[PDB]
Design a protein around this ligand. Sequence first.
Ligand SMILES: O=P(O)(O)OC[C@@H](O)[C@@H](O)[C@H](O)CO
Length: 188
Amino acid sequence: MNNTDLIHLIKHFMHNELKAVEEVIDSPLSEFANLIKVLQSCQGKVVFIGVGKSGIIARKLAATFASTGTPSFFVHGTEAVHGDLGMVAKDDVVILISNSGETAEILATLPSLKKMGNYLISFTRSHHSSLAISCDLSVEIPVKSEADNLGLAPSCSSTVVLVVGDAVALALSELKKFTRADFGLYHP
Ligand SMILES: O=P(O)(O)OC[C@@H](O)[C@@H](O)[C@H](O)CO
């Protein structure tokens, strides 16, 4: 493939991701106000749980929440069922990220988390997913397709969830009057 065509091929995939983000910005995001309110009410930490590429985005979002004034950390969904559920205590709020809302490893956390009693939020592509049905607040982040021809590689979905989560973090940060001086304290 010549240089100009290589460049168009790269821009094709970038553009697919751009479209997926646009689809979400153009959507009503009705439950986002309730999402903000639940997060504002959290008296403990916001614990993000995921596996695979969702889990890597969950790690980014925990770090972004923390760096902008909302204490948060990440627990991997498999490590959770091998003891790390012990990191989650009564006042913590749990956000579980799974694009399908069917990932076996993430659903495996749910019986214990129901016993533990924490407020559970899901980020999935469907309110009808197993995970979403089991959570207290389902946030639906619709993703039509992935960017690859096969539609198999998390690309559109991982990027959309990152943009959505970043915007949530920044709205909470602005709402709580997080300052440059607070930012410097956590970023020496
Ligand atoms: O986002 P869910 O549907 O949980 O899928 C988890 C993983 O399978 C996915 O992110 C993984 O990296 C495979 O692509």
